[PDB]
Amino acid sequence: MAVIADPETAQGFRLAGLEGYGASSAEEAQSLLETLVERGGYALVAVDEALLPDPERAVERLMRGRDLPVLLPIAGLKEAFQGHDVEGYMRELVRKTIGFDIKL
Template sequence: MAYRIAVITDPETATGFRLAGVEVREAADAKAALEHLRALVSVDYGLLAVNEDLLQGTEDEVARLMRDRDIPIIIPFPAPKAQLESGEDYIARLVKEHIGFFVKLR
């Protein structure tokens, strides 16, 4: 039997997964994510990757859903956090990553 992969994530990160060819279900909050999980666990999915921010406070419910199932495997993934940094901070961080030292730019 061939299993499918799906991602449950917020609308901001859904586009990137769609561009990679992954089936995506969008959820704005934990309640919507749980609704998607309930719908997908009984279908032919082998892996469900879920934005970890959407699983906050739902651990008991997810455990109940998966109690008597081996598949699908539910994997939480960290949501990317937008970082706003100045161009100078960005360059300084890149220099530090490559040479191992912080260099103060003027």
């Protein structure tokens, strides 16, 4: 697996045994993670929501080929302590995948 949220989380995952590449960059991180995706020795890539609210742009290159890796938002160094909006994120995901705004 791999994490590209921020250098703090990258170092933490490197300690746990999950290599990380770089810091939070709104431009070069997409290319870096795509170059990482170019090879298939894992199954997951994790990004904080602040850098990338949705990985749909990255996964648009994966539905055609190598759908095995999973792109999902995670919690960064500070917003984790702040408190991630579980209900809001789940409601947004449900409204996106269904097309209707419903109560969870």
